[PDB]
Ligand binder design. Structure first.
Ligand SMILES: [Mg+2]
Ligand SMILES: [Mg+2]
Ligand SMILES: [Mg+2]
Ligand SMILES: [Mg+2]
Ligand SMILES: [Mg+2]
Ligand SMILES: [Mg+2]
Lengths: 308, 308, 308, 308, 308, 308
């Protein structure tokens, strides 16, 4: 069509990869900063009447990456872009989605959604939202792509042992049972989730039969990595052969690398929706699968077929 | 203040009760139908400058009850209501909140939220939303009150046996562990959640140690009641002494009464956010707690203190 | 084009007929209820980029039929429908359009109009609005098609007697004189419209010369049918040969059938913008003309020519 | 309260009168033109937190008077006006409210309504809208005050003859029967409304018994005055003793004065919602009643009581 | 494409010229007044799906011309215009763009911008806005075309003397230096801008070396012409050979003609974004260049290329 | 009143100072980051019904500081804040306000303005916007306070020499002449502003008589400081006794400190709308005046008086 792909500075390596698989290149645009840390944008080609796609995760630096996106959207609308599709592989601020007990907290995921609407986004792609309801936070079509085909694919690609699937927490049990079923279920497992009272210690206790099983932990994301380490050791305590930790989004804020190299997890496998830091890059535990091909197909299919 | 309470025909018994505890009465308004089933509304008193509260669950008849509300809101705004607070104890259409696998489904919970915004709602109360993210579906303050204090209260009021707390499904595990903790945890339990392949049978298998324990099932709602029956029998199969089924919202669509009188649950206990049908009313298993007092306090506190 | 027709459950017989005359069939979509009376919708085919038309009157069950429409619109927008055209042959809630004497009434016709805007309607068709100003209630193009060509057509098709045209009330005098003129005027006639004081009786007195004339009553709609019966008898009292009652919308709420079989009207003739009940279906007085062909042409002409 | 009254240049004489009866004076504001015919506005006093009322009909010069209003509203909002109430005794562009036969005409009454919303109007007063549905064209409370009490008052004040009430056209029959009833009805009367075919002549024929009756014509407005002259002569042809022509809005565009001094109407009586031109001012037929007192009460009652 | 050009009554001579250079003619539309000075509009041809351009400056009569535009936009949207492009060569109310010292003034340029948005404008052209920031006042693409190419063109076309460029005031210094540079700069010059205190006299003093130089005054607009006369005489006082006054917009309100024929300026040269009055038309000083060709190219290029 | 002041992390020192002069303290709120650089906000006190003021410049880190503000606004609205006033002493992104030559640039100042509207800001304070038109970019009241009283105050406080006032560039000439007049004008001066062609060198040439005058440079802001250094040296080249550089906003991005310590400016004097870096803090040239008192008065006066 008049399909154009632009990329900000959040996920440039990934944006190129989606471009490669769609046999085009990234549109000409200066996206940087002024000397004072305000974002500078200039679209250096005619987008008039074009069906444009902005590939940019809203990941760390989150506000900076968000603002880049937002302001790229403004520039393209004012430049008579035919249609603007925001492709945000990792949707920043996804976790903040409610006001529990009427806490005087923002619902910042909704704020971003508004802000994107306002600036003129016509549609969004994201992979594996923290809660799918965020699709409702928008007033505009949203295709929330699952990165679990490719994970399962890899899980099979190795296979070669037992195995069973494990929810690292209370909240991922939905996500985990799905992948249990999608595999040849069995099996299942859940983690405590057990204070009170004296010592704020964790993990406490698992449920499920992990005798000599070669385990597969799975979650939507990894931040810090304390979540999954404390589940891995607890797994291993029950004779778990090998603990493989799969997830889509590799955040890895605050001391994650140290946790992972101090972890008992044999391999951690993550998708490329967030660029890996030098620390994590320099780690043998970790290996990244690409959603490039997934994302390519999805943004082509807005050619326009459906998904599937 | 200039606080006025109005009620449509969704929850009139409950609306009166909240009025009693706030030592006022329901404002004068004709809310009915024309001969052709279009809703007729007339506010038969001066609401000019008033801080008005419309107490009306959006329950079966759902669209009818929704439309009543919506049109009562329109009439009060055009009548110069100072502020309109919609108190929807049971938020109809709450379950529809996402487009899984890009199903070409509506996000009807968001549609209602929009429609309420549009017509001029300034704030909403609801009790126990199916997903709390719905608070984000609105562009306006929303106080989502938990009806679990009063449930736990009742649970204590009987006590007199073991007991442990049980999630009737995959999705309520969050809700159940909370009530487990709020009690003197222990304990926990989850239910299958186990097809494939040949026979679409359920329940399959429980996780947790229910030997001679006197159980407490808990969920946000009851619809049909197949969900909880199939968990009750499965519980009882493992020597569970007494199965008490607690939930906030008593929907009870489609053959629920028959399921409950054919159930193995010793007592089912529900809040009064939805009027009980004659069938369910005529049942010894069931007993309703009132959120009247809870709701009274919450709508007074918009006097205006916070919650707590 | 990429023209698709979908139908909810308000006017399925009529929707099929418009499809027949446009030599296509109704798109695949599940439109029903859940067990609890919330509407279920799924569009079971790709509407991406499509010019879609939702054929659905907002008639009894009015809120149910309205909500179906509204939620079908939401699902199609979120499914990237290119353009959504709501074809509402009978616009429910059309009568409520003002706040006489500052009555604290809703302007529910405007509320619906808003609600339709909000959910993403790009244009509406309706036939014979109660007041044409409703076109202003929308912020979007509205083609209000007259079903009077086809009525006059039928009136001619029989002819064979005098005849003159008669307004059944104060408010239809505009509508009636038009059809008087469109025919070979003469003639005209109006009805009381005469209380006070003691007995709330009606009709009182006619104006106009109906000696031996073979009459033609005409109105936008029929509800109850008391309106037209009391005019028919009054006509007949002045030697009117045959009273034919024509109108577009056949509402027929509350005891209409009994009124009609107890009426003195020789034939009542109505369009098919509202499905007839079993009672009315089982009546010899009545005969329905189709707007199928009218509606077909109008929705094709959004191919896109003008109207005419 | 913090009630302030401001006036533009549309109805300054009337604005003063409403101020007199509310025992306050018009706020300090420069409202004029620049040399090039763009409106200049400056609010020369603190309106911060104030409940302000802008008294300004949107009458000839219509766009000029409209723009004055609109821009006065903008200045007061940006000056932190607590609330803005637009009091538009005569709502300009009221007649244009539909797109008959899908004419490619604007619905300019709705456009004004939007434009007023946009600029931040919180409520409007108008007297006797051409169609009441315009109340729906707004998204905000609208009190459409009837100027018929004061008319009837005057009608009584003279009395002293028969009399009966007469609709000057097809469209005013609703308005006329009301005033017929409000008086000691009898009586009624309607006018042709009779082309085709050869000569575009009018009036043709009356309906009703006007033998020696002392008549009372009534309409919402007077423009040109051909409408009412041609009804007056036709009345008089049937021995009508005296024809009194009452209406709220005295537009009097295009040769109205000549028509009136060439008319057969004994007295024409109009309200002061539009300033009379020098021509009409210099005419013995005409006499104006004030809505000053009516408008005063209505804008006080937003103190805030209801109407009544 | 389906490109259509319509014109109101603000700039009909110019609209025709743009039509000539695009080898099409102005679409059929009645744009006038009713007898009472409300604008009448009817689009007398099918615009359904069309890419329409409304050529209409918002110049004196400003509100009248603005309203024409606004209501033409409403009619075309409701007539299913594919896209509406407002081409406003001279943007009325451009000067009012701020609230200096928190003056309780309107920001009427923003009000117009809103009003245009509201009514459904999809894009605007204007030539030489008073402040370019007005592009921000809109929420929609705005191409602000410079009429300085054609001015410079003419300046060269004569050449034949020195020359240097002169800012007639404090505020135009930006505009003037640009044209200085675009020429073979040198040179520059600025004007006082010098009260206090006793006598409100002006001009006071120039800065720059104008010995025997053949000058070129340049500004965005001419209103009154006192601005430029008082600069011309001051220039001439310093031996300036010939003072040529160039500007885009020829407003010429209030006694401008007298000022110009009493001026010392040898030639005044202006673009045709505003029709010249009879007075100015009858003046030898003045000569108009056309932006017809400029505007033609710009509205074609929305074919759609970029600008350049 | 119920006036509350909250502060984010952009200007905490200044926020405290405004609090001191208003004899209250900063409200309890956690404003920080999560481990992954998403902003965390919690309002830890009841704001229900409160008139709240958020004191937070949108300065470096700009997006971070902007997002803090935006999300604090969201949290307070959802917490039923009575009214939200954003006090942004330095409005980030102010410079980007147009699309010169139709550059495909964002109008990011307008984007921020939208984003603030969207999230629910009811009013803004800022000091010395780069262009005042930004007041128009908002749809809500904006008080743009001048920090020039306090500057002039200081200028007098030293006095003790000649002096005259100097515009450091083409664009500040408006700002400079004002301060010239506000002082006992004389005098004035402007700077080149003189390329082409071979060497991109600057400054080139001054206009005005600076023989032995003790100068005063003034601008809205300082970024880099190359702007003012190159004017200072050029001033000094013409025997200027002492060059004092005054401005409101002390940005000081990119090597500003080095430029200033390498400058020829005797003293630079700036307001405290942006915290000074350690580098600049450790500099003898510089001295900061407080707008604390100015801002205190302005936010009190929304008690509510006017400004003045
Ligand atoms: Mg973690
Ligand atoms: Mg169930
Ligand atoms: Mg009836
Ligand atoms: Mg007339
Ligand atoms: Mg001038
Ligand atoms: Mg600089």
């Amino acid at each position: 069509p008049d399909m154009k792909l632009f990329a900000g500075n959040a996920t440039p390596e990934l944006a190129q990869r989606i471009a490669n698989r769609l046999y085009t290149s990234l549109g000409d645009a200066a996206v940087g900063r002024f000397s004072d840390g305000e974002v500078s944008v200039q679209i250096n080609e005619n987008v008039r009447g074009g069906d444009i796609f902005i590939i940019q995760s809203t990941c760390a630096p989150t506000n900076d990456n968000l603002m880049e996106l937002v302001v790229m959207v403004d520039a393209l609308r004012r430049a008579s872009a035919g249609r603007i599709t925001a492709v945000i592989p990792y949707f920043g601020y996804a976790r903040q989605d409610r006001r529990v007990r009427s806490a005087r907290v923002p619902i910042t995921a909704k704020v971003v959604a508004d802000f994107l609407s306002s600036v003129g986004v016509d549609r969004v792609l994201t992979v594996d939202l923290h809660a799918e309801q965020i699709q409702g936070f928008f007033d505009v079509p949203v295709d929330n792509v699952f990165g679990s085909p490719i994970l399962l694919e890899d899980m099979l690609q190795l296979n070669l042992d037992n195995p069973i699937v494990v929810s690292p927490d209370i909240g991922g049990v939905v996500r985990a049972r799905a992948i249990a079923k999608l595999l040849n279920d069995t099996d299942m497992a859940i983690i405590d989730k057990r204070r009170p009272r004296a010592n704020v210690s964790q993990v406490m206790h698992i449920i499920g039969d992990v005798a000599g099983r070669d385990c597969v932990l799975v979650d939507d994301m990894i931040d810090t990595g304390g979540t999954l380490c404390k589940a891995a050791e607890a797994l291993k305590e029950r004779g778990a052969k090998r603990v493989f930790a799969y997830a889509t989004h590799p955040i890895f804020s605050g001391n994650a690398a140290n946790n992972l190299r101090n972890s008992v997890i044999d391999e951690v496998v993550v998708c490329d929706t967030i660029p890996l830091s030098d620390e994590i890059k320099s780690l043998p535990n970790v290996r990244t699968l690409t959603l490039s091909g997934m994302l390519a197909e999805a943004i082509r299919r807005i050619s326009n077929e459906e998904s599937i």
